[PDB]
Design a protein around this ligand. Structure first.
Ligand SMILES: CNS(=O)(=O)c1cccc(C)c1F
Ligand SMILES: [Zn+2]
Length: 140
């Protein structure tokens, strides 16, 4: 579990969005595993605007933050998980590291701020759903 809280937006994995998220929907994309809902209180996070490929992610299934190198946002085919079939997922970055289903929503951060959230796992890789191209997250 986990979310990004930027301005009056809550960014979650689409597969973990709640009824309240869907009832207060701003934007969702299944191909990207992302959903954004509206918030009453303003949030503590800053979104990275950059092409970094080094950063740090939180792994709940280790209670640990790991430094990683990651691929740029890409169209990947993802093997079946507990929450999704084997399918192509867009705007996905891969790193070598530990990810189980409950790790989804962990933040990946670089020197410029939040890069994305854990979205895929397995075979010793961790995938992150990029959010850095979402420029409207920064206004309105
Ligand atoms: C098919 N590629 S993608 O994974 O959807 C993607 C990644 C990065 C930037 C863009 C605009 C994009 F289309
Ligand atoms: Zn950066």
């Amino acid at each position: 579990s986990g979310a990004i809280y930027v301005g009056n937006y809550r960014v979650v994995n689409r597969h973990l969005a709640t009824h309240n998220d869907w009832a207060n929907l701003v934007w969702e994309d299944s191909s990207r595993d992302l959903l954004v809902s509206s918030t009453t209180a303003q949030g503590c996070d800053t979104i990275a605007r950059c092409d970094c490929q080094t950063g740090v992610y939180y792994c709940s299934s280790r209670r640990k933050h790991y430094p990683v190198s990651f691929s740029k946002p890409s169209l990947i085919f993802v093997e079946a998980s507990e929450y999704y079939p084997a399918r192509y997922q867009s705007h996905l970055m891969l790193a070598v590291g530990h990810s189980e289903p409950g790790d989804c929503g962990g933040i990946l951060r670089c020197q410029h701020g939040v890069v994305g959230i854990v979205s895929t796992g397995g075979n010793g890789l961790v995938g992150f759903a990029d959010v850095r191209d979402l420029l409207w997250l920064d206004e309105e």
